[PDB]
């Protein structure tokens, strides 16, 4: 099984600036790329930043020079840090890992986690 646990979500202010950490657990052969997308209602589900294993990434164009994604490999997890918080911010959150499960194969599957609420208030 592989797990992801996402953390940092909730109620912040308009301007602050956040942090969301997602933590991939269980048993797997290698993580591809890991990373944060967000929906909010009626909105389409969109990339906010990414991070692959060698160290690429790629950042959506709403937080490009106010976010960075980081990752810590030894212990599977990535981090979003997030500033200049503003109402357009507010989403359900989601992290997603690429996921190779056993090392003989090529195929990936891919996770998303549950999401976590970030609301935006002014």
């Known amino acids: 099984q592989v797990q992801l646990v996402e953390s940092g979500g909730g109620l912040v202010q308009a301007g602050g600036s956040l942090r969301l950490s997602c933590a991939a657990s269980?048993?797997?052969?290698?993580?591809?790329?890991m990373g944060w997308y967000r929906q909010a209602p009626g909105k389409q589900r969109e990339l906010v930043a990414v991070i692959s294993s060698g160290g690429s990434t790629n950042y959506a164009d709403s937080v490009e020079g106010r976010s960075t994604i980081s990752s810590d490999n030894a212990k599977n997890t990535v981090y979003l840090q997030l500033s200049s918080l503003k109402p357009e911010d507010t989403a359900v959150y989601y992290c997603?890992?690429?996921?190779?499960?056993?090392?003989?194969?090529?195929?990936?599957?891919?996770?998303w986690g549950q999401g976590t609420q970030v609301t935006v208030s002014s």
């Open positions: 269980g048993s797997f052969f290698s993580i591809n790329d």
């Open positions: 997603n890992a690429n996921v190779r499960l056993r090392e003989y194969r090529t195929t990936s599957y891919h996770y």
